[PDB]
Amino acid sequence: MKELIKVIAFDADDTLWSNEPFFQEVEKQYTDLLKPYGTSKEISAALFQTEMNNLQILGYGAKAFTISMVETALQISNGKIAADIIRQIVDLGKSLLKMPIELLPGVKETLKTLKETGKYKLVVATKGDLLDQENKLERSGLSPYFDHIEVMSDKTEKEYLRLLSILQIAPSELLMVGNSFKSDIQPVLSLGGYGVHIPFEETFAHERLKQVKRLDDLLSLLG
């Protein structure tokens, strides 16, 4: 921590700001549009199937989500769905790209304090559409605290190794902070790095892992 960690990487969505609630409300509104074709659970299962079938070419993010929404609508309706439902679906997807940014507790004070130490390089480590993530950061007001954003095509060990290489450090010099144990924490621990898990409201404990309730609790862990 003292003279091991050089880089503190932060997940963005549900770590720096709320994201999943906005997405889930969009998914709810989508499933309301496809009522004739199934229960909300059923429509969500079909959409997830499409997302998974599209994963290798579309990847992650709001643009991918929008395209899978349109496809699933076309599919489940046997290509008979009204064009106006398609217009609504595209509008829903675009709402995701203009979502207002609501910072989570302690985020602003933590990043300011870390910036003012001048001790760590601070980066955002996120999947998704590059422009979207860039825009979210800008409108969060947090851009002055961050050296830059690393947008990733996935969050497996392979992509974290690419991140480490780009940053010119070894795994033991990286601290990753995020809400997802599976995507933000596990892969980084597996490589040799450190994690702070901040759940957003199945895991295991680990010597290079701490779980905290809110992001500002990070500051005592560094001291």
Q: How far is the CB of 84 from Cl ion (least distance, A)?
A: 33
Binding flag, residue 189, Mg ion (CB under 5 A): no
179 labelled binding-site residue: yes
134-173 residues in contact with its own copies (CB under 8 A) are: 134-135, 147-148, 151-153, 162, 165-166, 168
Task: Mark residues 18-57: x for contact with Mg ion by CB under 5 A, - for none.
Answer: ----------------------------------------
Binding flag, residue 41, its own copies (CB under 8 A): no
19 or 31: CB nearest Mg ion: 19
54 labelled binding-site residue: no
11 labelled binding-site residue: yes
Task: Mark residues 124-163: x for contact with Cl ion by CB under 5 A, - for none.
Answer: --xx------------------------------------
In angstroms, the CA 76 to CA 189 distance is 41
In angstroms, the CA 77 to CA 61 distance is 24
Q: Which residues would be at the binding site for Cl ion (CB under 5 A)?
A: 126-127
Q: Which residues would be at the binding site for its own copies (CB under 8 A)?
A: 56-60, 63-64, 66-67, 70-71, 74, 77, 79-84, 86-87, 90, 93-94, 97-98, 129-132, 134-135, 147-148, 151-153, 162, 165-166, 168
Q: Which residues would be at the binding site for Mg ion (CB under 5 A)?
A: 11, 13-15, 61, 63-64, 129, 179
